[PDB]
């Protein structure tokens, strides 16, 4: 339980989509609150623990952020084996990215068949949207949930996780609870603690607030 990171429950979530969609940025936002401006490719898979507090208690989503560079196939089976839910990400400003969604939601279903999957249309903040919400019909055919999200502006940032939690747990009434604040560590040390801090600081310094089309 503890090894898994499941307070009570742990859910294996596979995050897939084309390169440059914002999968990594989405995960980073949830973990730290920072907005990653720099696009650095994810190689293979990066496993990131994310905990949310709900009405029924804390739940952990072990997010498997996968590489969008990799070709669809049997090579990628390990990532999807025993997945409980998935998020397929596309960029609303890229038609090509949207076109590849059926390929992602084919490779995925080959391994896990029917499991809750949410399609997220990233970068909705940008004014010149190419893939209109009205146009998207893929979700209807495949019985997937669709959410307009913006990593940059945090628009509907928590919705995919919440929806997935509701279906997996089985309570349609599940709601996010703030979570009692736990006192921060004093921080004396230096061995395990050092070096890692610099990485976060750099991300923060580089990041300027994303005013794309916030005004509109």
Curated annotation (Swiss-Prot):
For the site labelled Essential for GTP hydrolysis, the residues are 69
Impact after mutating residue 70 to A:
Strongly decreases the relase of bound GDP
Tell me the tissue specificity. Expressed in a variety of tissues.
Where, per the database record, does this protein carry Phosphothreonine?
Answer: 24
Cross-linked residues, Glycyl lysine isopeptide (Lys-Gly) (interchain with G-Cter in ubiquitin): 71
Identify residues that carry N-acetylalanine: 2
Coiled coil regions in record: none
Assembly notes: Monomer. Interacts with RANGAP1, which promotes RAN-mediated GTP hydrolysis. Interacts with KPNB1. Interaction with KPNB1 inhibits RANGAP1-mediated stimulation of GTPase activity. Interacts with RCC1 which promotes the exchange of RAN-bound GDP by GTP. Interaction with KPNB1 inhibits RCC1-mediated exchange of RAN-bound GDP by GTP. Interacts (GTP-bound form) with TNPO1; the interaction is direct. Interacts (GTP-bound form) with TNPO3; the interaction is direct. Interacts with KPNB1 and with TNPO1; both inhibit RAN GTPase activity. (Microbial infection) In case of HIV-1 infection, found in a complex with HIV-1 Rev, RNAs containing a Rev response element (RRE) and XPO1.
- Record's protein name: GTP-binding nuclear protein Ran
| Protein source organism | Homo sapiens
């Amino acid at each position: 339980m503890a090894a898994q990171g499941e307070p009570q429950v742990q859910f294996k979530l596979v995050l897939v989509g084309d390169g440059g969609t914002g999968k990594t940025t989405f995960v980073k936002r949830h973990l730290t609150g920072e907005f990653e401006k720099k696009y650095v490719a994810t190689l293979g898979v990066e496993v990131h623990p994310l905990v949310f507090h709900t009405n029924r208690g804390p739940i952990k989503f072990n997010v498997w952020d996968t590489a969008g560079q990799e070709k669809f196939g049997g090579l990628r089976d390990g990532y999807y084996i025993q997945a409980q839910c998935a998020i397929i990400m596309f960029d609303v400003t890229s038609r090509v990215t949207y076109k590849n969604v059926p390929n992602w939601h084919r490779d995925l279903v080959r391994v896990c068949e029917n499991i809750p999957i949410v399609l997220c249309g990233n970068k909705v903040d940008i004014k010149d949207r190419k893939v209109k919400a009205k146009s998207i019909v893929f979700h209807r055919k495949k019985n997937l949930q669709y959410y307009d999200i913006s990593a940059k502006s945090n628009y509907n940032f928590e919705k995919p996780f919440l929806w997935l939690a509701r279906k997996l747990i089985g309570d349609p009434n599940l709601e996010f609870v703030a979570m009692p604040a736990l006192a921060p560590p004093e921080v004396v040390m230096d061995p395990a603690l050092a070096a890692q801090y610099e990485h976060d600081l750099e991300v923060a310094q580089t990041t300027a607030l994303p005013d794309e089309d916030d005004d509109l």
